[PDB]
Amino acid sequence: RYKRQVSGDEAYLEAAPLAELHAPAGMILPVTSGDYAIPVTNGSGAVGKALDIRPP
Amino acid sequence: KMSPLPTVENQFTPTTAWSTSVGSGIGNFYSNLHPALADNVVYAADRAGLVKALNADDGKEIWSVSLAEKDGWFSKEPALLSGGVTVSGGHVYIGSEKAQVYALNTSDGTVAWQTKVAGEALSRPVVSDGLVLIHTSNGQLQALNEADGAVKWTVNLDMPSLSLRGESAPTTAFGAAVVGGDNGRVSAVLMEQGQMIWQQRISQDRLSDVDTTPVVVNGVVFALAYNGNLTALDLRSGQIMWKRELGSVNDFIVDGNRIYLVDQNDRVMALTIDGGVTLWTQSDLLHRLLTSPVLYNGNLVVGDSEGYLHWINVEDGRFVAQQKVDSSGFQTEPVAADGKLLIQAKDGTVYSIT
């Protein structure tokens, strides 16, 4: 409840980037699944408070 | 809410010939137990197990006997008499919530016979064809031998999950018992061994219909159901002839070519027997929890929750008399035969009415 009033406010975050895991020789990493996979959407828009979330 | 107490200028003025008291009576328990008149003597009782015979003019006590079994001076268990009272053939028939039916001698109040039945003998025992018909809280229609009270035969009507506090005492005609059912159905059965003739349904969350006492004239059975229709069934087939969307669980009288019944919500009315056409209607005693109506000296008499007796004119539905007779209240049915108008307040107090 009270915690949501902080999120509904404006608080932002910058967390662990995504680094692909290497595969040793004589084996392989498991399969992609692809469910949670984020495409590389190009360009820069404002983010975290810089972005105007007012309704157009 | 509850409708108030109608204010009515009453000429005539009724009275009380006498009033005798039985021990505590039915209490606040919904019960059928009511007085019984036969040969200038009055048989009444209470839930506790006490039966009394009374002179029908003095209200004086011929005999009195308790049917509650006691183990010593200290222990006494209520007999819970709930169905009755009925007198015919010099016997007094009463049904127990302990699933026992007692037959008492009219002479000394002695138990002629006692019999275990299929369950709570709530219904008014009806005597005919040399048998006593019991309608038990399990939808069991049993017939005890009038002589020794042996279970000659048993019919089983199906019972809904939810039921109103039964039951339906049957009417016997041409060797067949016509009974209403908690199912919502009128069932006719042969008196000999309980052969199933026909079974007609007149029913229409929890919307259901318990029946209770049908009446037959000239090959037409008449039956009434909870929030279900009133119906004139053909006595031979049990085929519905004419309907009427209105219900009740207290008895109704058939007289002349009219009908009067006490509605779900305690409306007194007058219907035509041929088509159920409404004549007069009295909504002034709404939700006062009226008792079964009776026909007394051309007037309709009904008791109510606050112990008021209401006398209404059968021609236009106008009241003709009003009366306070007991504080305990009136719930069970009046008995109006032999010119004697008996009734029983919940506290077991019987009342002769002139």
């Binding site: 004589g26 084996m27 392989i28 990493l29 498991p30 | -």
Partner: protein
């Protein structure tokens, strides 16, 4: 604490019904689905039967089944305990 139970139940008899040269479906039919395989390169049915009642320690047999390129039993490795 409560008894720790882990892996596949192995009836020691169900281990008899399996012999080299079976497809994965027969072993699967006769031993049920393996709780774990090898997710790294090879493919191997791991049937661990581990059970541990409190203050009695672990009893564990490891039934390791190695299938070839074509999903057919080539090696049947049974360790009925540990030390």
């Amino acid at each position: 604490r409560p008894d720790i139970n882990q892996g596949n139940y192995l009836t020691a008899n169900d281990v008899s019904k399996i012999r080299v040269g079976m497809t994965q479906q027969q072993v699967a039919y006769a031993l049920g689905t393996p709780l774990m395989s090898d997710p790294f390169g090879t493919n191997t049915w791991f049937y661990v039967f581990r059970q541990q009642p409190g203050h009695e320690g672990v009893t564990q047999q490891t039934l390791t089944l190695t299938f070839n390129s074509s999903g057919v039993l080539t090696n049947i490795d049974n360790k009925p305990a540990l030390s």
